[PDB]
From a paper:
In the first category are TCPTP, SHP1, SHP2, BDP1, LYP, PEST, PTPBAS, DEP1, MEG2, and GLEPP1, which have a “PTP1B-like” accessible pocket that harbors a basic residue corresponding to Arg24 of PTP1B. This pocket has the potential to accommodate pY at the +1 position as in PTP1B or potentially other acidic or phosphorylated residues in positions N-terminal to the substrate pY. The new structural data and analysis presented here suggest that a secondary substrate-binding pocket, similar to that found in PTP1B, is present also in SHP2, BDP1, LYP, SHP1, TCPTP, MEG2, PTPBAS, DEP1, and GLEPP1. PTPs with particularly high enzymatic activity against generic substrates were RPTPσ and PTP subgroups R5, R3, NT1, NT2, NT3, NT4, and NT5. CD45 and members of subgroups R3 and R5 were extremely promiscuous and dephosphorylated most phosphopeptides with reasonable activity. All members of the R3 subgroup as well as RPTPγ were highly active, and it will be interesting to establish how this activity is regulated in vivo. Surprisingly, sedimentation velocity measurements showed that all single-domain RPTPs studied (IA2, IA2β, GLEPP1, DEP1, and STEP) were entirely monomeric in solution, as were tandem-domain receptor PTPs (RPTPα, CD45, RPTPɛ, and RPTPμ).
Protein tyrosine phosphatases (PTPs) play a critical role in regulating cellular functions by selectively dephosphorylating their substrates. The ∼280 residue PTP catalytic domain consists of an α/β structure, and biochemical and structural studies have led to a detailed understanding of the catalytic mechanism (Barford et al., 1994; Zhang, 2002). Key features of the domain include the PTP signature motif, the mobile Trp-Pro-Asp “WPD” loop that in the closed conformation positions the conserved and catalytically important aspartate residue, and the phosphotyrosine recognition loop. Here we report the crystal structures of 22 PTP domains, including two tandem-domain RPTP structures and a detailed structural comparison of this protein family.
Residue numbers in the entry:
A (entry chain A), B (entry chain A), C (entry chain A): -19 to 0, 1019 to 1139, 1151 to 1155, 1158 to 1174, 1177 to 1188, 1191 to 1201, 1211 to 1225, 1234 to 1300
The structure:
Amino acid sequence: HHHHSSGVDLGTENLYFQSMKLIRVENFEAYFKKQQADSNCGFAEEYEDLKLVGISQPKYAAELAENRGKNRYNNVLPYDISRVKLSVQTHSTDDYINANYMPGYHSKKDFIATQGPLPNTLKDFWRMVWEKNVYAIIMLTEYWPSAQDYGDITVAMTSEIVLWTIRDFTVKNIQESHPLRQFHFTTTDLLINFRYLVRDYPILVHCSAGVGRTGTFIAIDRLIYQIENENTVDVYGIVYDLRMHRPLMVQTEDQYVFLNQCVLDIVR
Amino acid sequence: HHHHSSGVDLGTENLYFQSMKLIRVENFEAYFKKQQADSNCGFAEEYEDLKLVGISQPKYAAELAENRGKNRYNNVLPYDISRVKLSVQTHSTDDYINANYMPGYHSKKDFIATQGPLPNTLKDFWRMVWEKNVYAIIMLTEYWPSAQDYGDITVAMTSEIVLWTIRDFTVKNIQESHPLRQFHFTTTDLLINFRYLVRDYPILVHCSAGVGRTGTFIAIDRLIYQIENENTVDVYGIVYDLRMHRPLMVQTEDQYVFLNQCVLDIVR
Amino acid sequence: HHHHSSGVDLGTENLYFQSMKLIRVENFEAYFKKQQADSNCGFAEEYEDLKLVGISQPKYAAELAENRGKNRYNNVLPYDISRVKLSVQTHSTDDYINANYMPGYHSKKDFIATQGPLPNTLKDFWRMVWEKNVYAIIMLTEYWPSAQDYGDITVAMTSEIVLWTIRDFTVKNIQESHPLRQFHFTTTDLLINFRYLVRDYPILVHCSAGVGRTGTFIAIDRLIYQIENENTVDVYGIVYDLRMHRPLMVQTEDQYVFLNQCVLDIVR
Ligand SMILES: [Cl-]
Ligand SMILES: [Cl-]
Ligand SMILES: [Cl-]
Ligand code: NI
Ligand code: NI
Ligand code: NI
Ligand code: NI
Ligand code: NI
Ligand code: NI
Ligand code: NI
Ligand code: NI
């Protein structure tokens, strides 16, 4: 615990000053109207203000020569500070998975946001799932046994209900097993509903780059907790916080604006 | 959790090195004598050593053009890092109140230190009281209904005992209510007694600028807890910590020296 | 809670990136073989990589003119950030003891690592023991009453079993008493056994400079907890963390390599 003087770390200064924008829930009606005017231009400004948040943070792991083929996109790289570090065997660079711990409402490790695994990273994906005791997966878009072995880990599917759909697997170290529930997702009703569905039961959330839909989902889960326990809304401040842990969370003005659309609904 | 190398933030370095001065309570007699000698000159040095603590911290919110009329004094401005951020409606700058969270003995949000509200900030004052769930106010010197509405908040007075005096109000959102107890204060006996009085029952503490009497009060409350649970005294280190969260806490050598006078008494 | 941008504090950057090297316990057999090859050369590289960790941290207290005679060696000085600060009487510099809080598995104050006391620091040593509520001492190599007074503290010996050996003392403020147990230590069996012995019963650990054997002991205690609760090993990351709080913890390649020898055993 230390405070910083002005001038040391500009990023830290942004954080103290304008990292957050609280609205009481009983004023969100009036406020949402204000921002959906001149065609969303108010939300476009909040969204533009967030654009540089957290992008100055180091990402050495992700940029090493050996870890190039483990990243789906070159512009979506995990920040060193929040990345998920796997165990090691042959060299340090085994530890790498394009994945970050994201804060939820209750703690900082509530989520792992990650990209949809590559052919050459499926082994690492399941390793991550086992090592970090992952019990739920949220697929927001075929890396699973329709049992298959992936490295030192064996994955068996044990239930499939197609309605979104729900799947149950067992993950086992081939040298001990935990069970897993994956929630596969396929108006704002559907998103809000899909989440309340999910919440009955570290939550790994992936879309394709692990950033747009992934961010919208995590965000809405947090907003809902804040709407039920506090009686307030902070879309700006949640995305800010997500950006401080992984780049591009909520990737388009439309997703940002859409989050706000979901909130406006819950509030009625 | 990170440690800093030397040279990064001199303020942080001061904090690691000489931010604190512990005296066992059974040695405070001997020590107090030492500092009240050559006419208080020992306490004058501790007091001079504290003079620059925390003043290099950013205060952007407080210095914006729109927030000028919300500050009673121009030399008492809240640091960004600890300021109380209110909810928003028309623009960001609604969030502003000249107020800081101050640490108490038990946590960092134990107190809010603030200035005595201005005519144009009474609405914000009551909003702060409601939003941040304030149950006690400590007035250390007429912003209350002798019910009145202040913005979206309604304040009714429900009890007044004049002895110091004690008042009870109800604060209500005009769109849910909590009750409030205000302790209005009017030798070191009176201060020590006024506090023990207060403690039976986030505590908002205000004098005029929210800094001298405000700091002396908070400080003495902490010292007393430290004297009862630890068996030690750290006046220097408490003021240091208060300065790291709001400027000028304990504003004159006389208040500092007076805190020490109160301690010397409790110790007998 | 703040993250830092790249470039602010290189030490902090090292911490985010390569501060840690996790091995699942069921892979340590294969990994240990790899590092004991070309005559320990793999462990020599891990050990060389750790050599600069934490050495850029400020140590003002330890370097002041008045505190020179309180340090056994001039190259083993406590970092300001973790040093143990004693109470004061005649001036600030009374607070000084060549000692640092070291993190254990459960918290950051689990250990105090310190040098074997000097003739002119025995008073401070016992003061530290009393003030910081020390219940166990681990001697890893005659500062105790075979009752003697040391400053304002009286130390009586109450039990001595010679087998390593175990001693019990009572420490008393001569102006209240707690009891104390000292564990005096005299293959990897003996170290692992000596620890399990110790653990039945802030733990002060000292060798001569408070750094080699001291570090090996603390480290092995942490590794064992990590092997029992996680099912993993991180020798590199534990020493790293110890170096961030006191210099030279695990002082030779042989101690580092020996820690790994102890782990390899437990794993069988
Ligand atoms: Cl973090
Ligand atoms: Cl703070
Ligand atoms: Cl620390
Ligand atoms: Ni800390
Ligand atoms: Ni912390
Ligand atoms: Ni603070
Ligand atoms: Ni942290
Ligand atoms: Ni630390
Ligand atoms: Ni920092
Ligand atoms: Ni904090
Ligand atoms: Ni964080």
